[PDB]
Ligand binder design. Structure first.
Ligand SMILES: O=C(CCCOc1cccc(Br)c1)N[C@H]1CCSC1=O
Ligand SMILES: O=C(CCCOc1cccc(Br)c1)N[C@H]1CCSC1=O
Ligand SMILES: [Fe+3]
Ligand SMILES: [Fe+3]
Ligand SMILES: [Fe+3]
Ligand SMILES: [Fe+3]
Lengths: 304, 241, 239, 301
């Protein structure tokens, strides 16, 4: 519990929730019952032996892990599946059909494996891994109700925009939203959202629009940074919408002065990249900045 | 488009999206798209004609559960539905509320049973004495005040443009009764609805009384009417005179 | 966070609800009209009867002399800007083509400086045709402002008719006739084409009673027969 | 381009005189009638009269002078230019004129204006403050300046306890001074300038969003904005004010002092107003605004 507005420490977060591993790339644990548990977010590969450790503190039996929820396909939210699913015999991976099929596509999983193989610690020893198409997956659809436990009824909501497959999970009983990256990267130093539009801006903004409509949130849990609460989590969606349009204004103004995409990409990198050095090679962060600026220049409404 | 950068932008984008449409189904599809974009699950569009005065036809089309349509029309709940009848008395939108339905408890209970637990209804009168109504509905979220205002505006724009396009496409639900009067017959009916007899009309129009009575007979034939009173009353109710 | 226009709407409503005197309502209308960029405005009510000479009452801020001229030549009968509302709910931008049918009115209005303007129609919930016009002298209506205006005028006239009905203005008032359920239902049946005997049968009363009821109804409308009564009742939304 | 930024004519009727940093605006009401807006500083008078000479043949035909508020950078020319346009009525809010009648306010303004002269410039002639040709105006007053210039006054308290703005309804053109803030020339967003009251600032931005869609937006610094920038100007200023509010509240929930963010804001912003604002006053104004925000901002749970 606490007076704080952001909980950002491994360990228990609420009466049913725990944060496992590194707060940067956390994995969330839900206690559905006395002998039933579920996971959320797939984290990165190199934390496999850390998460596991943390996990075993809370669960007496790994066979009591019955569900694992995954927001999307990007390397940084599914890299633990091949390594730890072999130790969770009773687990269903739950992802969107686009995300499910990504794991079948050779090229996609190669990008995943590469980016996740690049974030090891000098002499890190990866454990054995199973195939991506061998995972125990069940595809979910927009609006499906996941009866995980008696007092855990989560709804799936399509949140395309960040990627062509992103989905989020709404625990309506506790007004808790696992939102992954659909809102962006929370700026720990300023308290505002950093837009992460890596596929389509119209869909990203329409998804944030739809998430604004939800009941007032008490807990807002993105893919990076921990759990937000209070008034920070209530207007999270509107704030992400606002910051995305603010960046659109910035880009359009800079281009009306004659700047190139790469220039603003370098500026944004200078000001943001410092947060994600531990789990994102700087060059991929700069490339993602360039890609987002591309999409914004394409779909942003001109000023005439 | 319909997007983000301001309300006027969404307005113009909606108009441009609806201009090329030459099929009513696509019009309703665009309307449903925007309704869900607003945040609701189902919608409905109703047209209340003024006649027959005893049982005025109230035609409906929407996306409520089909079983609810079966029940609604089977027991003709459409006659004394408060959401529609408010439009006869007010130009303001009506947010669904228990107090509003104090007079029609059965209808409200059954609608709640079908998930139509929250909703709102906007009326507007077409320039031809028709009462058109646009309703939206969802299941679990109550309408907050700020969202009430937002809705009111967006629904007004949407229903205005919808009625415009459906008039341009001559939908059967709005066509009511296709009746055209000639200039002579229309002015004769104008005089008759002002109380003039056959002879006074014959004098004023400088024609014979036999001609005037035959024009009356034709007019009756068009309205499927047995006398002049029905013709005059229905023409006044339909805005033809 | 849903359109800056919403703020203008909320402000106008807040400004117009506490007012309980019509003069202030019209004053607020002038305030907003001038704030948009127009010089004068007008609000007209066209009643449906007499069908030959329909009442057209008006209230606004045009020069009084042009009002004298307008009523003198009963321009309210054949004013194209008003007659547009009989068939359409869309706004009308003043244009020569619109006034080709009534050139004298347009020529004289132009003589008084009313060179640019627009008119928006709306139907009150009582079968009355209300219309709101705005006008200025030297600037043509640009495209984007045309739509912005259109929306603002729609909102303003809706709220205006509502508030003036809530204030019981005489210009909106119609011929005061009140019927009871029994006589109202009798007139509903008669306007559906039923004869005296058929009505008497359905209502389980005598035919002499029904014709006496007819006389009752006629006496109120100052009507010579049943047809006038039925038509005026249908036009007034009483049945 | 999307931004106009030069002394001289802006459009078919208006002119920017003097320094774009502390500009004065000139309205041509008619063939032989002119009006002024913004009172500027002492330091640009020597630029005023001359650049004015390129547009006006006779100075005597200036009949009105509009003043937004009592700050040194929008008022200080009264001793310099007022005496020689004798048929002029200054039009200002009760607050502004009363400030001009107090010795303390005029002393602050005079010191801050003196801080900006060059070591070579000499001062032109000067007159008193309570002798000015003043007339009080009210919120919503209609100024029939010219046949095609009907402007409305709108009270926009918040930036100061007296700020007002002017809306030309015919051209949908809004002179807003600082009530929206300092336009970021490098990013294209608004920098809040809350130096008296935040609630009044935000309610003023609200009342301004209610105007018809703007074509031309004219703040006190940076020139004229057109297109989208002018349409959502008030909305964007409101949004950026709330953004700064959230930044401050977050930083305070981590244990940071207002100095922490004030110094940082100075570092990142003051460079724009170095020509007409001593850096220490910029830091102090950042601190004042952050104090007001921390006072009136909505807390969290
Ligand atoms: O919205 C309206 C008026 C129109 C009703 O339209 C309907 C009703 C049933 C099936 C269909 Br499809 C459309 N009434 C409300 C009252 C509460 S439930 C309801 O439909
Ligand atoms: O607006 C209307 C209808 C009349 C409303 O204006 C009027 C008329 C008379 C007195 C007053 Br006050 C306002 N007609 C237009 C047609 C083009 S010029 C004009 O006034
Ligand atoms: Fe991602
Ligand atoms: Fe991520
Ligand atoms: Fe200032
Ligand atoms: Fe200033």
């Amino acid at each position: 519990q606490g007076h704080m507005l952001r909980l950002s420490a491994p360990g228990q977060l609420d009466d049913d929730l725990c944060l496992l591993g590194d707060v940067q790339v956390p994995v969330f644990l839900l206690r559905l019952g006395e002998a039933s548990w579920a996971l959320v977010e797939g984290g990165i590969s190199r934390d496999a032996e850390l998460v596991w450790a943390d996990l075993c503190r809370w669960v007496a039996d790994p066979s009591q892990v019955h569900y694992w929820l995954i927001t999307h396909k990007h390397y940084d939210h599914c890299g633990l599946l091949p390594y730890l699913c072999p130790r969770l015999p009773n687990v269903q991976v739950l992802a969107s059909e686009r995300t499910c099929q990504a794991w079948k596509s050779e090229s996609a999983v190669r990008v995943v494996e590469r980016l996740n193989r690049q974030l090891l610690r000098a002499e890190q020893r990866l454990p054995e891994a199973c195939a991506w198409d061998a995972l125990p997956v069940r595809a979910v659809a927009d609006g499906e109700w996941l009866e995980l436990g008696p007092r855990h009824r989560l709804q799936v909501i399509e949140a395309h925009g960040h990627s062509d497959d992103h989905v989020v999970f709404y625990d309506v009983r506790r007004r808790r939203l696992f939102c992954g990256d659909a809102l962006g990267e929370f700026d720990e130093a300023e308290g505002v959202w950093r837009p992460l539009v890596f596929d389509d801006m119209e869909a990203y903004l329409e998804s944030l629009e739809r998430l604004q409509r939800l009941p007032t949130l008490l807990q807002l849990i993105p893919g990076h940074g921990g759990l937000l609460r209070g008034r920070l989590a209530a207007d999270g969606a509107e704030s992400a919408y606002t910051e995305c349009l603010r960046l659109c204004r910035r880009l359009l103004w800079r281009q009306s002065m004659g700047e190139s995409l790469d220039e603003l990409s370098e500026e944004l990198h200078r000001a943001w990249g410092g947060q994600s050095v531990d789990f994102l090679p700087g060059e991929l962060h700069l490339g993602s900045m360039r890609r987002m600026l591309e999409i914004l220049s394409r779909q942003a409404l001109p000023l005439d | 488009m319909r997007n983000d950068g301001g309300f006027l932008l969404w307005w113009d984008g909606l108009r441009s999206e609806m201009q090329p449409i030459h099929d009513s189904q696509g019009v309703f599809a665009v309307l449903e798209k925007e309704v869900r974009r607003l945040g609701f699950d189902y919608y409905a569009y109703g047209v209340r004609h003024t006649i027959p005065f005893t049982r005025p036809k109230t035609e409906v089309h929407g996306t409520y559960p089909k079983a609810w349509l079966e029940r609604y029309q089977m027991q003709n709940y459409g006659a004394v539905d408060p959401a529609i009848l408010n439009g006869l008395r007010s130009s303001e939108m009506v947010v669904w509320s228990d107090s509003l339905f104090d007079q029609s408890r059965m209808l409200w209970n059954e609608a709640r049973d079908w998930g139509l637990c929250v909703g709102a209804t906007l009326p507007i009168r077409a320039p031809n004495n028709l009462l058109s109504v646009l309703s939206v509905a969802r299941d679990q979220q109550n309408i907050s005040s700020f969202e009430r205002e937002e809705i009111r505006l967006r629904l007004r724009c949407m229903i205005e443009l919808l009625t415009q396009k459906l008039t341009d496409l001559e939908h059967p639900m709005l066509m009511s009764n296709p009746v055209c009067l000639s200039h002579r017959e229309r002015e004769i009916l104008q005089w008759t609805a002002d109380g003039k007899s056959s002879g006074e009309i014959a004098i004023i129009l400088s024609i014979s009384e036999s001609t005037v009575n035959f024009h009356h007979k034709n007019i009756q034939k068009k309205f499927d009417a047995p006398n002049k009173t029905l013709a005059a009353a229905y023409a006044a109710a339909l805005g033809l005179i």
